[PDB]
Amino acid sequence: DNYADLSDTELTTLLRRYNIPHGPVVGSTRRLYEKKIFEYETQRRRLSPPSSS
């Protein structure tokens, strides 16, 4: 998509706009957040658990 142009704000606008379980946006767990954000919009996104699993 474009995880080589956006900056931190967008990460949080992509880790806080969908509400992905993200804590501190640090280097290590930086891609894991810009990477969850991939299926989140191309096959899955929330599908929260209505009953169990």
Curated annotation (Swiss-Prot):
Post-translational modification Phosphoserine, affected residues: S7, S28, S48, S53
Domain LEM: 1-44
Post-translational modification: Found in four different phosphorylated forms, three of which appear to be associated with the cell cycle.
Subcellular location: Nucleus inner membrane; Nucleus outer membrane
SUBUNIT field: Interacts with lamins A and C, BANF1, GMCL, BCLAF1 and YTHDC1/YT521. Interacts with TMEM43; the interaction retains emerin in the nuclear inner membrane. Interacts with SUN1 and SUN2. Interacts with ACTB, SPTAN1, F-actin, CTNNB1 and beta-tubulin. Interacts with TMEM201. Interacts with NEMP1.
Function: Stabilizes and promotes the formation of a nuclear actin cortical network. Stimulates actin polymerization in vitro by binding and stabilizing the pointed end of growing filaments. Inhibits beta-catenin activity by preventing its accumulation in the nucleus. Acts by influencing the nuclear accumulation of beta-catenin through a CRM1-dependent export pathway. Links centrosomes to the nuclear envelope via a microtubule association. Required for proper localization of non-farnesylated prelamin-A/C. Together with NEMP1, contributes to nuclear envelope stiffness in germ cells.
Protein name: Emerin
Location of this fragment in the whole protein: 2 to 54 of 254
